[PDB]
């Protein structure tokens, strides 16, 4: 049915054709390099250097797992055209999240207000609610201070 | 009768150009056409013919004082002895908006 | 070539509908499993996905720099997604009817055969002529006065998104 | 001489294209803008001529339907009447292909 599949690539699990007609390939490469980013992202946010660092590392997380609670909760088995389309709209919202992290850094204020200039660079598109959720928790500690 | 059904249905979809640029000179006080389209360049169609006096004396008289939905009206006419009687109840709606500029 | 074809029509092309840089989709040569004069539609109908595809190449690569630029992408998003939407319906019909021809969907895909075109040309304007800032407000209200009411429809909601960029500077700034 | 000896129902799939406004079929190949029948077509009846009469009447219908699809080409590819008077021909089409497109079921 191959649709377990390619729902299972978006968890980082490899499969049988996953590993680490005949146009289906180029078809399934564009939902393929979608899951490079979800692995390339627990690899990079997975310590609990800096504080401010920290909380946009504990911030991240709190993302994630709604992508992985938004998966495996609609589809038991759809149409393989129906993931490419459902996915799509969300899908390049994960490739953007490559541009901002690096898959240096800076650290302390020095990144505290370099997320801040990215949000009036992208405000009024569809961006404006992750970004702004993160700055709203990657200020956190900074506040106490 | 189906022949006339569909020239009826074919006509509507080809006035509405003009039916457009018509109320909007009338409401907005200014003639909007494009490649000068409109017969009034500023060689005549006599499907408006027995009402243009009408228009022209009401087009000319509201650009004077401004410095100082036509096509959705006709269609829900049809809703309510084609094309000549029938057109003959269009004019009611280009008139009685001509009498209240004019006055 | 049933299933091969919607996924032509939705950005990935294969060995029977070979792909090119300059001209689109088209048909690659003659197969025995087709009929000899049925090849015209197919052309035709890749036209229509010929458009689709300098649609995404276009949106992914956002490019020419600017807030109302960019709000105009996902405005062009919000346009194509019937296009999604109808294309889609198809499966639930083959699934259950493996035998229909491929009339049908050229009978079905008539109203997409004609927006696009009127509004691939807005962007064409924007590649050649670097309509930059608020000027796109104009452009796209340019077209908007256009004949065809679905054409009139579909850029009418375009206004209506890229407008949400200015009010909000406006009233940030007002 | 020879002939193709085309089956029957192949034939009514092709006039069902003539009527449709698809072009390069084999049979009423068009030259100069003017589709006309070919000259090798024959069914086991019909004689090889009375086909060429029965097609040749058709024929001047996908004149007709014809060069209204090399009209509507030639708008597609700011008159705002041409342009809204296709509108309404090519509405009047898909009515008509639809009718068209379910006899082939």
Redesign the interface.
């Known amino acids: 049915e191959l649709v377990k599949d390619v729902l299972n690539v978006l968890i980082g699990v490899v499969s049988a054709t996953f590993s680490l007609?005949?146009?289906?390939s180029?078809?399934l490469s564009?939902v393929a390099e979608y899951g490079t980013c979800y692995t390339r992202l627990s690899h990079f946010s997975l310590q609990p250097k800096g504080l401010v660092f920290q909380a946009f590392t504990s911030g991240l997380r709190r993302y994630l797992q709604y992508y992985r609670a938004c998966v495996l909760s609609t589809p038991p088995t759809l149409?393989l055209?129906?993931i490419?389309?459902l996915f799509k709209?969300l899908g390049?919202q994960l490739r953007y999240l490559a541009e901002l992290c690096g898959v240096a850094f800076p650290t302390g204020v020095k990144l505290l207000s370099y997320l801040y200039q990215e949000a009036l660079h992208?405000?009024?598109?569809?961006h404006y609610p992750v970004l702004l959720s993160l700055l709203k928790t990657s200020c956190e500690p900074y506040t106490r201070f | 009768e189906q022949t006339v059904s569909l020239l009826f249905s074919l006509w509507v979809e080809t006035v509405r150009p003009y039916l457009q640029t018509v109320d909007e000179w009338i409401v907005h006080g200014h003639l909007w056409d494009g490649a000068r389209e409109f017969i009034i360049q500023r060689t005549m169609v006599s499907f408006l013919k027995p009402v243009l006096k009408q228009i022209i004396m009401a087009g000319k008289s509201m650009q004077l004082l401004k410095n100082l939905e036509l096509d959705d009206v006709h269609d829900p006419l049809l809703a309510i002895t084609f094309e000549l009687t029938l057109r003959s109840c269009l004019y009611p709606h280009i008139d009685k908006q001509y009498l209240d500029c004019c006055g | 070539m049933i299933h091969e074809l919607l996924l032509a029509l939705s950005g990935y092309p294969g060995s029977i509908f070979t792909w090119n840089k300059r001209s689109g989709l088209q048909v690659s040569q003659d197969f025995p499993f087709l009929h000899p004069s049925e090849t015209s539609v197919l052309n035709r109908l890749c036209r229509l996905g010929t458009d689709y595809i300098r649609f995404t190449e276009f949106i992914e690569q956002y490019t020419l720099h600017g807030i109302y630029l960019r709000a105009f992408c996902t405005g062009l998003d919000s346009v194509l997604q019937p296009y999604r939407q109808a294309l889609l319906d198809l499966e639930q019909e083959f699934l259950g009817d493996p035998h229909l021809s491929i009339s049908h969907v050229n009978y079905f895909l008539d109203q997409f055969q004609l927006l696009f075109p009127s509004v691939m040309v807005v962007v064409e304007q924007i590649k050649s002529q670097k309509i930059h800032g608020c000027q796109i407000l104009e452009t796209v209200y340019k077209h908007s006065c256009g004949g065809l009411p679905p054409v009139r429809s579909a850029l009418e909601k375009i206004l209506a998104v890229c407008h949400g960029v200015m009010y909000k500077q406006l009233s940030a700034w007002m | 001489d020879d002939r193709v000896l085309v089956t029957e129902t192949q034939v009514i799939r092709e006039t069902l294209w003539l009527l449709s406004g698809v072009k390069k079929l084999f049979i009423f190949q068009l030259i100069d803008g003017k589709v006309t029948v070919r000259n090798n077509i024959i069914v086991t009846h019909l004689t090889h001529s009375c086909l060429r009469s029965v097609l040749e009447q058709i024929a001047a219908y996908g004149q007709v339907v014809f060069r209204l699809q090399e009209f509507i080409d030639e708008v597609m590819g700011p008159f705002r009447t041409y342009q809204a008077f296709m509108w309404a021909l090519y509405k009047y089409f898909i009515s008509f292909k639809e009718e068209l497109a379910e006899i082939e079921k």
């Open positions: 007609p005949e146009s289906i180029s078809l564009e149409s055209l129906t490419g389309f709209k390049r992208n405000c009024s598109n569809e």
